């Protein structure tokens, strides 16, 4: 129905990522359960410590969802589980701003 995408992207929103887990894992933890994994990404703070969430990528949409329900609350990864969800890319239109009032 939504025909109009030459090779889209299917990423997943993960959360509750212990500060002991890193990308190297996020990827494997997934790529292992699903061979359609592109790579794992974990967000970090100014210091470089896992904020507690991240995002992953895949090649097949069919699997993407399967994980959301399957990998759901994945405990195997990091002492704490992982909250799977459907994230969305830059969905908006940026516009230039300007200011400069005047009175008479």
Swiss-Prot record:
GO terms for cellular component: cytoplasm; nucleus. It is found in: Nucleus; Cytoplasm. Keywords: Cytoplasm, Nucleus, Protein biosynthesis, Repeat, RNA-binding. Residues 10-89 form the RRM domain. GO terms for molecular function: RNA binding; tRNA binding. GO terms for biological process: selenocysteine incorporation. It comes from the Eukaryota. The keyword Protein biosynthesis applies. Involved in the early steps of selenocysteine biosynthesis and tRNA(Sec) charging to the later steps resulting in the cotranslational incorporation of selenocysteine into selenoproteins. Stabilizes the SECISBP2, EEFSEC and tRNA(Sec) complex. May be involved in the methylation of tRNA(Sec). Enhances efficiency of selenoproteins synthesis. Component of the tRNA(Sec) complex composed at least of EEFSEC, SECISBP2, SEPHS1, SEPSECS, TRNAU1AP and tRNA(Sec). Found in a complex with tRNA(Sec). Interacts with SEPSECS. Associates with mRNP and/or polysomes. Found in a complex with EEFSEC, SECISBP2, TRNAU1AP and tRNA(Sec). Belongs to the RRM TRSPAP family. This is tRNA selenocysteine 1-associated protein 1. It comes from Homo sapiens. The gene is TRNAU1AP. The chain holds residues 94 to 184 of 287 of the full protein.
